[model samples]
Target: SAAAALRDQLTALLSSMFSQGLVDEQFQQLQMLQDTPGFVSEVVTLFCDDADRIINEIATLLEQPVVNFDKVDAYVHQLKGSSASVGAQKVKFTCMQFRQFCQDKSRDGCLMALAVVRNDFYDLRNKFQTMLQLEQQIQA
Candidate 1:
């Protein structure tokens, strides 16, 4: 029963996390889908890693001799889908704006958008780190 009480505290903490916009409702859904102790942490870590990779790829593509709007847009779209799936509301919103720039083939706008996207991802990284730390504390 004490463990149940501890779980309640953890759950309340998470409710505050979401309410403060640290995450979206979709995050709760993801947690429910897996319902495993470590699944959420693993998925979040991988998503952040992938976001870093894709952001770098977008930067690299922009530096190309001929900027490929189609390719860059594709990457942005992929990130958008994943961000949305993962309930990264801020990231997903930034990606939507980023994709708009990609569609317009505006290099300067894309660069600006890239900055926003990276910032959003960093925000998410911090939140996930907080979540993991909380889970670790609970495990102990």
Candidate 2:
């Protein structure tokens, strides 16, 4: 019954994520491919790693004496694409707003956007880690 318990936990976690709009149908699509074994884990790992790196890079770029809005936009664009792939709804939506700030070349706006997006990313990442951990327990 241990597996059943873990499965129920995972289901609850996933339902919470969906209800909170942290994820979307694209995530369900990703889950379908999980039959491949570790596929979902691998994808989530890559998304988290890339998101961390990209967020850091954006922060660093914003700290420059004269910010390169173009470069910043490029980074935000990449983040948006990646987030979309993983169905990170909130993060992706924040990225869209971040791009607008980038276009306006507003340092203050971009900084705020970065903070919001980073928060969303970390929140989603935490949920993902919890879900993956639950899945691992169920498999064991």
Candidate 3:
């Protein structure tokens, strides 16, 4: 029951975060992207649908018992690229630290990086939901 409630809250947060700034940014960029011939909105929609895939992958990389520096570096690089393209600040920030940790080859550093990332994600999620609600209010 509580888990369900939490999910609702998370959804609300995500909505607000997107509606407030992230979605607008993406929408504007997408409009510009669309104006160019053969540009893709599919990528944008995919990221919009479930950014959690990237999040989970980061968590998995951070929580791995044995450090695989190469794989971690690759994932961090991908995260940075994808998040930056989408203007996802929190994910991009996480990738920044993750990249540094990968470069240093320090499991402990990555672990600490994970803490920063988790906090960032929580904040982003909360803000997103609020933004969505605000948008809805304006529409109505």
Kindly provide the TM-score of model 3 when superposed on the true structure, using C-alpha atoms: 0.57
| Model 1, global lDDT | 0.84
**Candidate with best lDDT:** 2
Q: Report the lDDT tens digits of candidate 3 across residue range 1-140.
A: 65566556755755565665533365347547777432433554465445557556766866777778788777667766776776676667677768878889898887777677566656655554454454344334
Q: Looking at model 2, which ten-residue stretch has the lowest summed lDDT?
A: 33-42
What is the descending TM-score order?
2, 1, 3
**Per-prediction TM-score:** 0.85, 0.96, 0.57
| Two-way lDDT contest, 1 vs 3, winner | 1
- Say which prediction, candidate 2 or candidate 3, comes out ahead on lDDT: 2
Report lDDT (Cα) of residue 88, candidate 3.
72
Clashing pairs in 2: none
Across residues 13-130, which tens digit of lDDT does each residue of candidate 1 receive? Answer: 7787688785788888989988677788788888888889999999999998889989999999989988888898888988887878877889989989999898888877877877
lDDT (C-alpha) at residue 85 in model 2: 93
| Candidates in descending lDDT order | 2, 1, 3
lDDT of 2 by residue, 106-128 (tens): 99999999999989998999999
Clashes of 2: 0
What C-alpha lDDT, on a 0 to 100 scale, does residue 75 get in candidate 2? 94
- Runs off by more than 4 Å, candidate 3: 1-50, 134-140
TM-score of candidate 1 relative to the true fold:
0.85
Model 2 error, position 97 (Å): 1.1
Collision count of model 3: 11
